Symmetry: C2
Amino acid sequence: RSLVSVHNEWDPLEEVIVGTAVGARVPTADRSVFAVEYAGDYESQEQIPSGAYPDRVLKETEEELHVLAAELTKLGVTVRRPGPRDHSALIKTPDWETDGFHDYCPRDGLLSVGQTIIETPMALRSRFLESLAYKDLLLEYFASGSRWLSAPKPRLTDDSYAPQAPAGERLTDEEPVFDAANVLRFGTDLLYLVSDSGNELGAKWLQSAVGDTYTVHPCRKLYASTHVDSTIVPLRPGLVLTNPSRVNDENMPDFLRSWENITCPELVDIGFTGDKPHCSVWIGMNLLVVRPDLAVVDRRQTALIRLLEKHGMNVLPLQLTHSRTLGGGFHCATLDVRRTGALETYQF
Amino acid sequence: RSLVSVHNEWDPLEEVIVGTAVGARVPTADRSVFAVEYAGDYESQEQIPSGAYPDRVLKETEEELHVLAAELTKLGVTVRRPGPRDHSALIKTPDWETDGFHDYCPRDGLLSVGQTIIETPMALRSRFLESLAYKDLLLEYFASGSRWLSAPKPRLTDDSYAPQAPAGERLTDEEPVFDAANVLRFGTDLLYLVSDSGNELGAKWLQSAVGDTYTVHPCRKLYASTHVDSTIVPLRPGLVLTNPSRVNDENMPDFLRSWENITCPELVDIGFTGDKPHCSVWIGMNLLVVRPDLAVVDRRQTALIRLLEKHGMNVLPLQLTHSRTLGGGFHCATLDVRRTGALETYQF
């Protein structure tokens, strides 16, 4: 009886992983971090604000983070947190050198598709050994019958990046690279956004690793530059929330065309602490569905909670203050390893 | 029509990978290299002879290596060679730091079980990014329909090693670790030698990655301390060559008990250049079967060539002079990516 059993984004959550803010940082300046994350706000990679986030943001989001875990426990969910890791410790391969990121977004490079966990081949050199903080959880999952796979570790030479190109095109297609957060899971159907943090070869590879049961749907016309997370948010079978500045009627994936679609209201601008914000105001949409009638939304998105309730979706409004600074909402900041339920196909 | 299709050790070779001696070195002294390779000849890891092998050995084996590629080409096999890589370039993770090994033994950390290639989780930190020299080949294989997987990259902390234990017990069982060269492939049945370069969890993991079709047979009573390569040598279905100092009648794996077994004659001691030899005289047995009736054997093993011919096995005797120095025979120094044939079960 594997501990990892999960087929979609909305069934009744049994066990999740939450994630800390403890040594969060901005890696050293570098082609890849520049090309995938900051080459739209800064003139050159040497202007990226490398360094550790201010203590105030890590303190405050760590207590917010404690509340999330607390309430999910109250709801009956089993909460697991990351192991300790130094993010300033250097990582160095024959081709390049860097420091680490943070362990605030477990969603990003760990993908759970059934009884299997896949360590994806992340676009950023700093996240080269992303799963190191989770070795003990994984090991336990493994010893319980969960299948545990990894994608080949990428070369990630200068040629895989294209700072100067237009957005959603600065990640070349030389090898399978993709963050897990570029994939969304609707049972058999797997949606894969091809953008600045995941190429075509990555979805080529994603398909072979999960096999014929599932069908990977790569998308290159949505305007997400990086993760699908705050662009398409499924809520229960047959109802999906979309980002109106990005997805439209000529956009929408084909297997989702039958689901009823509710357009997100324009969000409140929670602030940002910095020079330039790290995330678009659309992390307001980064919600986490607990069961088909329960979802966690930031309590300042009163337009958004209203709407969700109008469609018979009860909310539990918690708050993540530094979301635009660290770039992570409830979904980015969690990883669901088991939801009660079975494997099905939602095309109506 | 994937370029990677191979079910066993002896069917008719179509495409192989050969491998250079170009920048071969002995890594910097370190717990893992000491525990898995030198802790039976040296008093402590600080005595290991780190450094680049003498030019004479690399020059001479590289021309010998040119002849091997030349003759297999003559036989109609497609020969591919590794890419260029600096082995002195440092590799550094949060836990440790090192320089690389060599790209002379493609067999060791790349496993081809059907249409799939598995980058195994190598026991030595210097071989942490073993597959980097092969990125372009694998990329091509990948783009051709071959399934391309990797085992989770190991933490490989001080806890996974046990210098002071008896041989075949200095690699603890904390996480799936195992070199591909610890596995031997007889179609459905996969023999996995559990020893100093591969644990029980590695075979636990190996089973999950390949699935129910195959059955992994872990072995802890053969006396190989590292690789199964020069201990059990299948030659054609129903005939296996065994190492008499290691395997016997109370040893032999159960699915092999029906195959007829021929005992290896005592070999010629080709020399070693160094202080202490790097491989046992039994690399004389590291032969490479090209087809069921053709095998490549070092031409100084005249007892062995005779015997093989006695059992209707034709040999093509080439020579690898520095085999006890670099530790690689014809099998260690090659990687077969495709043999003409199909998937079967040889239990008679």
